[PDB]
Amino acid sequence: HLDKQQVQLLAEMCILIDENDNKIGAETKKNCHLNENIEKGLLHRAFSVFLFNTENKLLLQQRSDAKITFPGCFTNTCCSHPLSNPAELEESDALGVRRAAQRRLKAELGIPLEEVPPEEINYLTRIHYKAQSDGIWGEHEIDYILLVRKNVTLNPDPNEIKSYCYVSKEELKELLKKAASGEIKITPWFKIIAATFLFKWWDNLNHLNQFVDHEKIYRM
Ligand code: DMA
Ligand SMILES: [Mn+2]
């Protein structure tokens, strides 16, 4: 009964990890997102991209109604998972995750691979969180937060997103208030980052060295 193309993506192989983000196996995206498996501890690696343009506006997307988890929710630029293959399993300088981010930026938003090569993708820190989308589907990940600063071109896949918009800080606040009123919905990872680190980073977009932490995994 769910969207066919999204169903086909449920077969992708995700990277299973222990609570310290050490790789321990691989499992399908479907199984990694079933609350029944999450309830037993199944945890996978993921990433969340926050992309800002020269005007310092953050690029948001509204997930399409076809997404199996949190459909129609407003959220940050891109969120997905590195796959269990040689290229994206690469742990050196989080290269696997940055390659996966480049791949999904192209697949979801239509950003050319060349505009967002790994060297343009800055890995800030990791956050561990768990949530439920519905009675059946949910999330449980150690999420690599990645930041991109560039004036990209876009050509999104409507199967992935039903809308996108660059927002200023004040515009994001009006957005968050509309979410608090149940007017609109936002994803759990965006809610967590927005309530903790987002605005701090946004103020130091030029000096995010003091905001990089590759040692600690923040437990949210
Ligand atoms: C980090 C995280 C929450 C991955 C979720 O990805 P998504 O549902 O936005 O897209 P997909 O799961 O289809 O790659
Ligand atoms: Mn996930």
Side-chain angles (χ1 to χ4, degrees), residues 57-179:
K57 292 191 165 178
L58 168 70
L59 174 59
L60 304 179
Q61 62 161 75
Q62 184 187 186
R63 295 167 69 77
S64 81
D65 294 317
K67 301 302 298 178
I68 299 173
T69 46
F70 317 93
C73 291
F74 288 79
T75 184
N76 55 292
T77 316
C78 174
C79 286
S80 193
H81 323 92
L83 295 182
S84 180
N85 62 32
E88 294 181 17
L89 274 161
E90 181 59 65
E91 303 265 10
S92 293
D93 311 310
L95 184 57
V97 155
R98 292 194 268 159
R99 284 165 162 165
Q102 163 186 47
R103 168 177 59 76
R104 293 299 298 169
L105 280 170
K106 175 167 188 182
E108 280 172 43
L109 296 175
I111 297 169
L113 296 175
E114 305 57 48
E115 289 180 2
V116 293
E119 59 264 29
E120 309 273 308
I121 307 182
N122 187 24
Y123 164 36
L124 306 188
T125 193
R126 289 166 296 175
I127 290 171
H128 175 198
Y129 80 96
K130 181 188 292 186
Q132 295 187 339
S133 185
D134 60 35
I136 298 173
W137 309 92
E139 276 287 12
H140 192 210
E141 313 172 320
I142 287 190
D143 206 11
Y144 282 57
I145 313 298
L146 312 176
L147 254 71
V148 174
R149 302 182 70 197
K150 181 139 181 189
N151 302 293
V152 299
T153 53
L154 303 174
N155 181 208
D157 176 354
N159 181 252
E160 284 302 334
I161 83 182
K162 59 188 294 183
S163 180
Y164 85 78
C165 62
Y166 270 107
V167 303
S168 66
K169 303 178 186 182
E170 58 185 64
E171 296 183 306
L172 176 63
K173 299 191 188 177
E174 184 164 297
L175 187 75
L176 291 170
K177 298 173 189 177
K178 292 175 189 169

Side-chain angles (χ1 to χ4, degrees), residues 185-209:
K185 302 157 298 161
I186 57 165
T187 62
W189 59 87
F190 185 50
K191 182 179 188 153
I192 289 174
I193 293 166
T196 57
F197 302 157
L198 186 55
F199 291 97
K200 300 172 174 181
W201 292 331
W202 209 330
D203 280 319
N204 293 83
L205 287 181
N206 298 306
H207 302 292
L208 32 188
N209 294 300

Side-chain angles (χ1 to χ4, degrees), residues 22-37:
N22 299 303
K23 174 275 189 174
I24 62 178
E27 178 58 271
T28 71
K29 178 181 177 182
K30 174 182 179 174
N31 284 318
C32 291
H33 294 80
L34 287 177
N35 294 330
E36 178 164 52
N37 291 327

